[PDB]
Amino acid sequence: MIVKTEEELQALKEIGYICAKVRNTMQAATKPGITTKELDNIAKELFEEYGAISAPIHDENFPGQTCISVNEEVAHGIPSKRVIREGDLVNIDVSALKNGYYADTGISFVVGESDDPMKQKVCDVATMAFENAIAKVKPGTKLSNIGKAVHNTARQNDLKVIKNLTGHGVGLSLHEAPAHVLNYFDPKDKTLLTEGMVLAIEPFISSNASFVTEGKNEWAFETSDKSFVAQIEHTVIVTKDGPILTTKI
Ligand SMILES: CSCC[C@H](N)C(O)(O)c1nccs1
Ligand SMILES: [Co+2]
Ligand SMILES: [Co+2]
Ligand SMILES: [Co+2]
């Protein structure tokens, strides 16, 4: 959406806070021996407490408050009896609405220690990619400069991006214009950011695969080669004074 009023801004900051709070709490609770359903239950309880509702359930009838994706799963993982183990690469993606306004945020992290430092590496580089992407964000700038930054960051670190996952406009719905914020540069795209524009920016950084495929069920996205992939996602408002992240605390 385009923010035009204080009251819209306040609504967006409110639901952004809630999603960040849920995301942080779930991440903190993630340890060997907990199931992803147990983690999802944390979101259930905090969403209720803060008067928000799950965006995956509301907008998509997703079977879970949040999306929790582990190891082979990159995105859209269904919380379940799956138990977290030492070394797991976990993505927790939290999106929700309150009073008609939305936020969307996500983080990948390593549980304890993996035997393969690449899991942390893709996490490190996803964080860098996000930072580099938003350095480029102001009214009038090319949407495609976001993907350019993300892919450049990947390349600088001998990594790849997931080309067929994207960011999106967000605000009055989970997904609205601009339809796709790419993780790479499209020379032909003349779409610009504007004052007040709200975007979910979510770089996916991969150790090998450049795309995801259908996974173990109707929802999960995976890589067949079991690449390690990390996401960082925030909801961002484009302003003259710089980006405002509603989902950063
Ligand atoms: C299945 S509803 C969850 C969508 C997710 N919040 C998202 O928009 O961040 C992603 N888009 C692509 C991958 S994760
Ligand atoms: Co998300
Ligand atoms: Co998203
Ligand atoms: Co999406």
Provide the CA 115 distance to its chain's centre, in angstroms.
Answer: 25
This structure's resolution (angstroms)? Answer: 1.7
168 is in an annotated binding site: yes
- Structural domains of the chain ordered from first start: 1-249 (3.90.230.10)
Ligand 2 mean position to 104 CA, how many Å?
5
Instruction: Characterise 142 by phi-psi region: left (phi > 0), alpha (psi -120 to 50), beta (else).
Output: beta
Technique of determination: X-ray
Q: How far apart are CA 176 and CA 27, in angstroms?
A: 27
Among all bound ligands, the one having the nearest atom to the CA of 69 is 1
Cβ(215)–Cβ(67) below 8 Å? no
Nearest to 221 by CA among 181, 171, 164: 164
Ligand 1 mean position to 211 CA, how many Å?
15
Please give the sequence-ordered ranges of beta strands (E in DSSP) within 29-174, or none if there are none.
53-54, 67-70, 73-75, 89-98, 101-110, 160-161, 167-169
202 is in an annotated binding site: yes
| DSSP assignment of 68-96 | EEETTEEE-PPP-SPBP-TT-EEEEEEEE
Paired tokens of 123:
């996490």
Q: How far apart are CA 97 and CA 30, in angstroms?
A: 24
Ligand 1 mean position to 86 CA, how many Å?
25
Among all bound ligands, the one having the nearest atom to the CA of 54 is 1
Atom of ligand 1 nearest to the CA of 219: 1
